[PDB]
Amino acid sequence: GIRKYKPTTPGRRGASVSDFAEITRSTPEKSLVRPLHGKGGRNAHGRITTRHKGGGHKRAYRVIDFRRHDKDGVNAKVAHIEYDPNRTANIALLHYLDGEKRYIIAPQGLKQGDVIESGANADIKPGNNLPLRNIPAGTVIHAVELRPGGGAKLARSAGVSIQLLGKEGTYAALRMPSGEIRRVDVRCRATVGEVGNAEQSNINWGKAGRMRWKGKRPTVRGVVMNPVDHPHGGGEGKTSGGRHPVSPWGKPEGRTRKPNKPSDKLIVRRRRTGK
């Protein structure tokens, strides 16, 4: 849920925070954590490639089984539901009855003690993971693959999901959270149900410092640059840019997808733009 902050300070005036209500434990699993450091938005040349990335609280990586492919038919009751700095969604520690612990993205309404099962014969209780071939055409699914074996890539951010519209031959036509309709090989693996933590987008971050705790740095805008730094800079007084809007490197607004991409045969409809 969301809990609001009392305006005791100008920095808390409209801010709100999450009710970490599904968070059943406040400490991760030790054997599933890897070291993770901060990169500053800088690539192998040491140079800034993505701007506005730095500072930010230290975080550690949790290993998620995005590739839930080896535990077929082996149940796993949910051990804990816990926080993750690297997602918007929470994570669930699964206790496979063979004696093996893993992490998955927690779906909406997942509880402790819930049996989760995998394989073609798995039922369609949310949490269960099985190939697109076996889910009825009309389920709402999350964390679906692009190629049969590559692990989840689609609809894994918090609160989102994919509607499986139908199946034709060896392809499944299913709509992205973006409204796009795409076709994916029916041999791909998917998990049933929406993603939890759906309210996380309703929260006011309050102050510049709170968004700096997240690894985000201030964004200066071109109209207040000089013409040597941005196409939008220059002029005396405030300007609208004196020019059609462009990126820092001169590029104009417009379509940016690479034409004639090999996957362009797999997109039924693109996404809507503002109606």
Partner RNA sequence: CUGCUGUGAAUCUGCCGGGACCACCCGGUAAGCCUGAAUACUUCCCAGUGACCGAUAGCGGAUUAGUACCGUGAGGGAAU
Partner RNA sequence: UCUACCCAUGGCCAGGGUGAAGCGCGGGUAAGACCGCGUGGAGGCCCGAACCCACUUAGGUUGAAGACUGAGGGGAUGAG
Partner RNA sequence: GAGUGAGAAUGCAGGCAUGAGUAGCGAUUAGGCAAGUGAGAACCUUGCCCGCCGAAAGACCAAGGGUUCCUGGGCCAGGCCAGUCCGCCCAGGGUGAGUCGGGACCUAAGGCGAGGCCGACAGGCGUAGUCGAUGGACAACGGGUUGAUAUUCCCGUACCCGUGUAUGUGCGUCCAUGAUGAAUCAGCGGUACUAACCAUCCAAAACCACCGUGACCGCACCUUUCGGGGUGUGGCGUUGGUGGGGCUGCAUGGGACCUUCGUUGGUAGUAGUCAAGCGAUGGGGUGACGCAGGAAGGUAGCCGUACCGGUCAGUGGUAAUACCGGGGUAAGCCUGUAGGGAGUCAGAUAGGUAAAUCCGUCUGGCAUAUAUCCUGAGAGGUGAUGCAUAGCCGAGUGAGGCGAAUUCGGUGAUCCUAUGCUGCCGAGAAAAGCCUCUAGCGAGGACAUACACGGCCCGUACCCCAAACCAACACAGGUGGUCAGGUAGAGAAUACUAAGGCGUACGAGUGAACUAUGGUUAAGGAACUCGGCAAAAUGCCCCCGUAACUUCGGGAGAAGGGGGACCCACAUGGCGUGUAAGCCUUUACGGCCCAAGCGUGAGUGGGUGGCACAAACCAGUGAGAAGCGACUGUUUACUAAAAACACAGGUCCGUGCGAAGUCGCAAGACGAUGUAUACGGACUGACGCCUGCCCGGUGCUGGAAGGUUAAGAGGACCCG
Partner RNA sequence: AAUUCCUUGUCGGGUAAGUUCCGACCUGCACGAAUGGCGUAACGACUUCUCAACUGUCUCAACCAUAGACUCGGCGAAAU
Q: Which does 266 bind (CB under 5 to 8 A by kind): Mg ion, RNA, none?
A: RNA
CA atoms within 13 A on the CB side of 187: 5
What is the footprint of RNA within residues 129-148 (CB under 7 A)? 131, 133-134, 136-137, 146
Q: Which is nearer to RNA, 6 or 228 (CB)?
A: 6
Name the minimum Å distance from CB 114 to RNA.
13
Residues 6+ positions from 193 with CB-CB distance below 8 Å: 107, 108, 109, 110, 126, 127, 140, 141, 142, 161
Place of tokens 């992205």: 176
Distances, alpha carbon 143 to alpha carbons 128, 131, 152, 263, in Å:
11, 11, 5, 19
The residue count for the chain:
275
Q: Which is nearer to RNA, 41 or 125 (CB)?
A: 41
Q: Which is nearer to RNA, 96 or 125 (CB)?
A: 96
What is the footprint of RNA within residues 174-233 (CB under 7 A)? 176-178, 180, 182, 197-201, 204-224, 230, 232
Binding mask 27-56 for RNA (x = CB under 7 A): -x-xx-xxxxxxxxxxxxxxxxxxxxxxxx
Distances, alpha carbon 101 to alpha carbons 79, 93, 97, 106, 114, in Å:
9, 7, 9, 15, 15
Under the binding rule (CB under 7 A), the answer on residue 236 touching RNA is: no
One of 57, 67, 111, 269 touching RNA (CB under 7 A) = 57
Q: Which is nearer to RNA, 101 or 125 (CB)?
A: 101
Distances, alpha carbon 70 to alpha carbons 114, 115, 119, 220, 261, in Å:
20, 17, 9, 48, 32
What is the footprint of RNA within residues 3-32 (CB under 7 A)? 3, 6-15, 17-18, 20, 23, 26, 28, 30-31
Q: Which does 247 bind (CB under 5 to 8 A by kind): Mg ion, RNA, none?
A: RNA
Torsion angles phi and psi, residue 256, rounded to 5: -135, -5
